[PDB]
Amino acid sequence: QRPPVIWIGAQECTGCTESLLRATHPTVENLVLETISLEYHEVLSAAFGHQVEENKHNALEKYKGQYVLVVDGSIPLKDNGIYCMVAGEPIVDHIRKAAEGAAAIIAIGSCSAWGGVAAAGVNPTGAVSLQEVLPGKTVINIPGCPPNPHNFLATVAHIITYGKPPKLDDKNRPTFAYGRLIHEHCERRPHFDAGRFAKEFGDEGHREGWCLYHLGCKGPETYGNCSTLQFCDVGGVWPVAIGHPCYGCNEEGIGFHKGIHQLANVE
Amino acid sequence: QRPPVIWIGAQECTGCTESLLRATHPTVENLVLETISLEYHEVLSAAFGHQVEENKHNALEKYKGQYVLVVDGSIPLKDNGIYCMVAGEPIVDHIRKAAEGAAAIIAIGSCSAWGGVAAAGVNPTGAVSLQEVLPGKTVINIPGCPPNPHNFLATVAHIITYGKPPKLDDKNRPTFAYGRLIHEHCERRPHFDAGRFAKEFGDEGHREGWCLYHLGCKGPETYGNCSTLQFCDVGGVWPVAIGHPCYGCNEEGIGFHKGIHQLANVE
Amino acid sequence: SQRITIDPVTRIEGHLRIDCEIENGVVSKAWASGTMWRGMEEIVKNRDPRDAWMIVQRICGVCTTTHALSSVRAAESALNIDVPVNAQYIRNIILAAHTTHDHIVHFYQLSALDWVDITSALQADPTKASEMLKGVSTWHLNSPEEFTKVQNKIKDLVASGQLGIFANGYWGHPAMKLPPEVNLIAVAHYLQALECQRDANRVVALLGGKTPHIQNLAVGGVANPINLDGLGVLNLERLMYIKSFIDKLSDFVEQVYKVDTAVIAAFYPEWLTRGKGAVNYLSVPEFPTDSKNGSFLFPGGYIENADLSSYRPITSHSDEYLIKGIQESAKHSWYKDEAPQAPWEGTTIPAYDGWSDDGKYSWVKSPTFYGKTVEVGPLANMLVKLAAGRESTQNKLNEIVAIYQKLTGNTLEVAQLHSTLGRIIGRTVHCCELQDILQNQYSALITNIGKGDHTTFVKPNIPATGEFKGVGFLEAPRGMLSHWMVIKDGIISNYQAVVPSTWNSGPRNFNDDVGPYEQSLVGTPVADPNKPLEVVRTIHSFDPCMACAVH
Amino acid sequence: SQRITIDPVTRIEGHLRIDCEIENGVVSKAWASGTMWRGMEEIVKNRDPRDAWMIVQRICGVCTTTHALSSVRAAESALNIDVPVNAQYIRNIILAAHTTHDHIVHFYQLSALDWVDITSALQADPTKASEMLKGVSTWHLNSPEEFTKVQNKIKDLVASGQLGIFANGYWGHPAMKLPPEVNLIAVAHYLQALECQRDANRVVALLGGKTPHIQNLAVGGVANPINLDGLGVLNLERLMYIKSFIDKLSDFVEQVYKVDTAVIAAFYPEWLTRGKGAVNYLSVPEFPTDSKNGSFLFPGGYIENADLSSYRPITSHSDEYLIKGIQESAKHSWYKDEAPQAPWEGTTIPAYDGWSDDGKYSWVKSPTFYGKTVEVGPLANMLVKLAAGRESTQNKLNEIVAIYQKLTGNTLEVAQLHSTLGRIIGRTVHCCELQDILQNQYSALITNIGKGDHTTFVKPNIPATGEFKGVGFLEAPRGMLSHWMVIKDGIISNYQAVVPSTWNSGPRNFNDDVGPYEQSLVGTPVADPNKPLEVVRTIHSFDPCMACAVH
Numbered sequence A, B: 001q002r003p004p005v006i007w008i009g010a011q012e013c014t015g016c017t018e019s020l021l022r023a024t025h026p027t028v029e030n031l032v033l034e035t036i037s038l039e040y041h042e043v044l045s046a047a048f049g050h051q052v053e054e055n056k057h058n059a060l061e062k063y064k065g066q067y068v069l070v071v072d073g074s075i076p077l078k079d080n081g082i083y084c085m086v087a088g089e090p091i092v093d094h095i096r097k098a099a100e101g102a103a104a105i106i107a108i109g110s111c112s113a114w115g116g117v118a119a120a121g122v123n124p125t126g127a128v129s130l131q132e133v134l135p136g137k138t139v140i141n142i143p144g145c146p147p148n149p150h151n152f153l154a155t156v157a158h159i160i161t162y163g164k165p166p167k168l169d170d171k172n173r174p175t176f177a178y179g180r181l182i183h184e185h186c187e188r189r190p191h192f193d194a195g196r197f198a199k200e201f202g203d204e205g206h207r208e209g210w211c212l213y214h215l216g217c218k219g220p221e222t223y224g225n226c227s228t229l230q231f232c233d234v235g236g237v238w239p240v241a242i243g244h245p246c247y248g249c250n251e252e253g254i255g256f257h258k259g260i261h262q263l264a265n266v267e
Numbered sequence C, D: 001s002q003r004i005t006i007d008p009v010t011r012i013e014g015h016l017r018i019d020c021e022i023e024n025g026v027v028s029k030a031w032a033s034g035t036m037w038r039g040m041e042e043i044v045k046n047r048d049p050r051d052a053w054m055i056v057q058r059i060c061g062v063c064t065t066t067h068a069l070s071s072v073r074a075a076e077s078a079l080n081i082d083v084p085v086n087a088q089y090i091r092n093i094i095l096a097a098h099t100t101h102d103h104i105v106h107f108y109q110l111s112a113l114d115w116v117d118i119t120s121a122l123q124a125d126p127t128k129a130s131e132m133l134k135g136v137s138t139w140h141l142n143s144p145e146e147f148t149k150v151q152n153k154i155k156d157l158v159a160s161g162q163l164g165i166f167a168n169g170y171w172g173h174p175a176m177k178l179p180p181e182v183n184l185i186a187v188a189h190y191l192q193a194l195e196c197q198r199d200a201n202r203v204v205a206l207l208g209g210k211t212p213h214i215q216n217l218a219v220g221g222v223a224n225p226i227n228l229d230g231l232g233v234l235n236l237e238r239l240m241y242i243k244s245f246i247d248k249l250s251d252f253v254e255q256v257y258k259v260d261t262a263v264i265a266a267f268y269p270e271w272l273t274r275g276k277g278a279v280n281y282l283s284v285p286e287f288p289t290d291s292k293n294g295s296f297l298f299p300g301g302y303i304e305n306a307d308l309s310s311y312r313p314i315t316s317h318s319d320e321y322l323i324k325g326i327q328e329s330a331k332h333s334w335y336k337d338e339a340p341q342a343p344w345e346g347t348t349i350p351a352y353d354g355w356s357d358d359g360k361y362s363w364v365k366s367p368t369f370y371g372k373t374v375e376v377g378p379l380a381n382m383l384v385k386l387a388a389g390r391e392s393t394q395n396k397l398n399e400i401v402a403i404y405q406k407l408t409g410n411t412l413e414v415a416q417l418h419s420t421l422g423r424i425i426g427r428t429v430h431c432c433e434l435q436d437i438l439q440n441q442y443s444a445l446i447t448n449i450g451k452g453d454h455t456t457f458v459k460p461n462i463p464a465t466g467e468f469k470g471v472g473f474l475e476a477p478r479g480m481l482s483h484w485m486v487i488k489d490g491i492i493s494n495y496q497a498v499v500p501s502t503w504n505s506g507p508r509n510f511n512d513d514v515g516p517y518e519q520s521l522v523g524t525p526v527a528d529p530n531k532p533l534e535v536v537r538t539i540h541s542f543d544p545c546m547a548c549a550v551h
């Protein structure tokens, strides 16, 4: 038997599920056939409508106390929950119900971890985080927009293999992935130190791989593993390495709040 | 028709050819079937002995002025070249003959680029670099023990696609791969800057991925792309990232000269 | 009549409810409803125009890249910026590679379980399954040994008793028509598809900086630093690596996806005669290759009342006829302002009042083109290319038809493309033609860099006063996308996205006219009203994306 | 009667010359000669014991990892250091993954072209070729379609007129016995092998820091920092990535390489009755799993006069019986001191004087074990495991034999393993058994880290006075390897490597007894003395490595 997972999407763009399709360890096919039993996931389920809702109810019962609950997207509280309705009920009710029997609860992505883009600006829908709607529960936060999928998959694997979550920081983020500022482990730090800065995309310094601080890099104020684990497992691929500043998408108050070219505070 | 290549190994360990077997862009099979015509390479050639020396002579004649000559290993001059004899003749003679009709000449690896490990210590065989054997020729140096194979393959590709070598530094090393000190583009630079150093493998700082300077890291005195391009195209794989200091294998006077734990000079 | 509700519709992006009235087992009327809103248009307002793309890219992570590209095009339009040609090549590669991943995943992961019965695959003979494909495909992974391995994977999953995402599927439904062997082949291909789409996204990642959600755009071009001789930038080694993945896509697309599309049509030919959503079609040209935001590799146009011979070409993203025709209504949507609005003057004022059959029932707006309902997406884009006499499209369709004809002895006529299967075919044709776009644009880039052009970015200036308007069009995997930006005193004063699934899934409009999803469902036979697979088959053919439709 | 020279022998590592006297069409006498020397032993002298491994790893890049591991084991031996068990797991994974790459490349890239005629593959019928493997292999990439694609690559290469490294090969030679179909199958597998070996090296790289030439060792353990919760170190995500590559190796090894090995024997059964190199065999136990440099997963031992029943087990790398037996002579080598030397007292003083049939003719020394010539490598290692009664080895050999039985109606006895083909078979059996080593050690590592042990390194101390002698043994791809270090006053005062290809390739010894290569060739039929393919067949079976043999 494989450990069961229930995945519920709230105000999600589906990028957090899509991250799984880039994963290699495990690939999504090996995740669902070998690593876990994905008991509910609306993007991939053969069943629809009343049949998939029956699946969910049956799994919630059969695996009570055993499943990992995963949520992507923010949860909208404005106007009594009506900005996300599934099967005629507010998504916040589906999530609270499923949280009751969960062995572990994970907020995958910035939206569920801290509200994310959906909670920015004027916050049209009163979008909030998963932790906000589950005050009695310890929600494991895996932020990023979307995170590297292995930030999620290795968190799940730690729960499965060693029987507890990975070590977390004081925002309940796994330290192996979010334990350090990007700027405190960035390969362009020597350039920062020397005052070697790109000033515009395509300028001479940009074309030599110099630091992106003066283009608005938020590495100095964003916790993550983007410079080390990077993305897509091909080597050398993260925003800064490609030539664009970190936007701070992992980090509440940075991504989606600060402008791309607004300068970060440096510690 | 594919551009012809003649590869001759002198005092080589075969690691420079073996780098090709890790390559992905192109893979070795696509290299030999699509990118080039590998007219002579003793490790993979169907023919042996008399038949293979026939192939070489025919190819040197047929492709006069057109082929890229590649040499791995050092060339031993002591005692009239008898420390490397192929088909009963000193390899220095095979190399000078092949050099006469070459369109481009590449020293792949530290041994052929500057003498490398084979020339170190007392230099028992009077091993020297390819450039030393070919004083009137421009030898492109692709150092490393062995280099990432794409430092070679993208050099060859530049010759083929655009008709000239890539831009080179003062040691005739391609700038895209060797243009910068490792320490001037190392992700552990923040730790160096903060005085966060591993002191012994397995200690608490080492287990947090801190800077390896006090373990003997030669990044401050080694030009290369090991922290950016890294190795094997899996993401995140170079010696420092794995936990061990750079030994300076790219750089004459550093690798095979200085002790692992001897400290580098910092600019 | 009987009333049914399908909520949630699965194997789509986002949150969709479909209701149907069924008379004597035939759908007589339907309702499409987007059930989740974020207000992304309002979230991006009152910001610097340069910042929009990073925010509105998050409209969707399935069609990642698309809203980012449309947003920068919209700001560029407002500012009158001509994008450097290298930047176009790079945007083009990203969009084509992304769309390759997207379409493959739609056919296999999202759609195949409408047509494929996994239980039936357990009864297959792997050797016979392999033999069925002799002379039908040259794909290297159709052996009985591959098929046996896949079959054993299914067997092991069923024997675990944990079917998960395969549980309570429509196994043995009367509308499942494939034989066991073909079911098994499709499962093998479903798993192989995952490798191919992963390679497509490796292309996207090496230029975008990651995927999902690329990070290499700018208003004014791209953030990729082109320097063949530079360490840590877009050099020849990195380009070679990109090319290595581009080269891995074609065989699966041509020998598996293209072939399966013909075969599904062969077993389900009645699906060529239902699921017509509209009589009018629209697509925009795509893949610009000059220094002035034009010279597109794919053509665009407008087809009215299915007449290909009288269609109107669209060759520019500044086409005034296109621009002025587009409006959206919220008469039957949960917004306050109901009269049709041009998007530069659009509002998005929420006004939720619950479901009403005759009132408001969706968060999706109702778009029209000069007052008409219009289907967008790969059916539209294929039909426009056929109307334009694009030989590449003609020839690729003919290849599908040839396989269909080999299996059935019948040809396909254009009339049969106005259907659920025609829509799927259009998608496949697009994916196949996109491989040549990738080769063409990679070669264009290498050639241009070789001529000494390393330019990638034109720094904008944004007047601190004045009001000015721009629109960025893009031909997305699901159809014509447009982002409409008004800038006033240097910040975004209005922002309206009109998204392809908005055209197709929108509810009844200001004139109570029915949109494509809702129209397509009239006539659908429903064998079992508790398990309305036939409804979902048609809906899935549009590749719904509700985060897109609603934003 | 005549004298031939094969110089260079290709499709090996390094520089080898083989000379043969042929009488009545059969080789009557042979000479093996390593024609390049570097003096790696002298280069590493007078340095800190801790630095040796990084230098001496460069003895060979084909058997990368091996000399690094033997060197740290030798310093650890001198110093009385017990290696942490996690460091053993990591070292073991590296060695097993490396050896997987190494043996696959040997069978395909280095050896197959002795047995396979590529021109003949052009005449093959791909469907018949595929049909031949039904019930013989379950490999998923033996379709007619795969084979047709591979045949077209060969066609295109031949059509271009640029055969390069395939030119002037032994096409149509009378000793080429494979049918066209089997030749084509072999070329397809040759290309598939390249993918598998790349995966094996991704395992190596993730622990080693790169390959070729790993960089994660230390006298005292390894440089990998174990911390499941650490950013930038060996955490659970990195371990999962390693595992993902480990899991990709087995199918090719079991369903292609293992089967091909049985098949080549079936077509070339005469090659079971020739190429015997010795009657004595040595291997060392490998893959220690305890905290004290022992508890090996693979057994070692010494076989005298082919008697498995009375072999001597070797269970410890500190076995004095093994240590005291080993000497090397330079009587017929280009060094000054000729009497047999124990390696702690070894010298390597060059004394080149040109070739002489009865004098010095090689840079390879002549090793003996208690005065006898000994074969090392996979034939030795398999015979020792059979002598030990190792069920895994018996069972794996039996699988190869069952395939051979099915194809030929004949069986294979242990007597037939003392041959060119038996040598090949021992190599394949080793590669197969190594996949369980990888699974076992990955699992042991995960389990041990879970118990709370993250220890990887114990810092050594090296007394500044005293003389200390250490030996590091390792069962390398080509056989028993040993590095012998003497430390005096804190620095290396002597360093001697005795390498497996030294044992096999070494010239006539102090008593003029013939080494394994030279012995193995006696009696070889040579149909055409100008194209001595049969000689190369037997020499390739030992997997020569001359950078290793000579150093």
Ligand code: SF4
Residues within 6 Å of the ligand: A011, A012, A013, A014, A015, A016, A072, A073, A074, A108, A109, A110, A111, A112, A116, A117, A144, A145, A146, C058, C061, C212
């Ligand atoms: S975190 Fe980002 S990728 Fe994930 S649901 Fe939110 S917007 Fe989408």
Ligand code: SF4
Residues within 6 Å of the ligand: A182, A183, A184, A186, A187, A188, A189, A190, A192, A210, A211, A212, A213, A217, A218, A219, A220, A240, A246
């Ligand atoms: S500002 Fe950004 S690019 Fe510069 S060193 Fe810091 S994280 Fe790296």
Ligand code: SF4
Residues within 6 Å of the ligand: B011, B012, B013, B014, B015, B016, B072, B073, B074, B108, B109, B110, B111, B112, B116, B117, B144, B145, B146, D058, D061, D212
């Ligand atoms: S450079 Fe290094 S890998 Fe290449 S031949 Fe020299 S020792 Fe071997």
Ligand code: SF4
Residues within 6 Å of the ligand: B182, B183, B184, B186, B187, B188, B189, B190, B192, B210, B211, B212, B213, B217, B218, B219, B220, B240, B246
């Ligand atoms: S000393 Fe080495 S590890 Fe430290 S920052 Fe410099 S190159 Fe990086």
Ligand code: FCO
Residues within 6 Å of the ligand: C060, C063, C066, C067, C476, C477, C478, C479, C481, C499, C500, C501, C502, C544, C545, C548, C549
């Ligand atoms: N494709 C796509 Fe998403 C939708 N609908 C956009 O644009």
Ligand code: FCO
Residues within 6 Å of the ligand: D060, D063, D066, D067, D476, D477, D478, D479, D481, D499, D500, D501, D502, D544, D545, D548, D549
């Ligand atoms: N294998 C190997 Fe190399 C040799 N001979 C060593 O040790």
Ligand code: F3S
Residues within 6 Å of the ligand: A144, A145, A222, A224, A226, A238, A239, A240, A245, A246, A247, A248, A249, A250, A251, A255
């Ligand atoms: S924008 Fe996000 S993906 Fe990483 S580089 Fe910055 S935290």
Ligand code: F3S
Residues within 6 Å of the ligand: B144, B145, B222, B224, B226, B238, B239, B240, B245, B246, B247, B248, B249, B250, B251
């Ligand atoms: S030892 Fe060599 S491989 Fe790179 S990290 Fe240092 S130059």
Ligand SMILES: [Mg+2]
Residues within 6 Å of the ligand: C041, C365, C496, C497, C498, C499, C550, C551
């Ligand atoms: Mg809108």
Ligand SMILES: [Mg+2]
Residues within 6 Å of the ligand: D041, D365, D496, D497, D498, D499, D550, D551
């Ligand atoms: Mg020696």
Ligand code: NI
Residues within 6 Å of the ligand: C013, C059, C060, C061, C062, C063, C064, C545, C546, C547, C548
């Ligand atoms: Ni979308």
Ligand code: NI
Residues within 6 Å of the ligand: D013, D059, D060, D061, D062, D063, D064, D545, D546, D547, D548
């Ligand atoms: Ni070797």
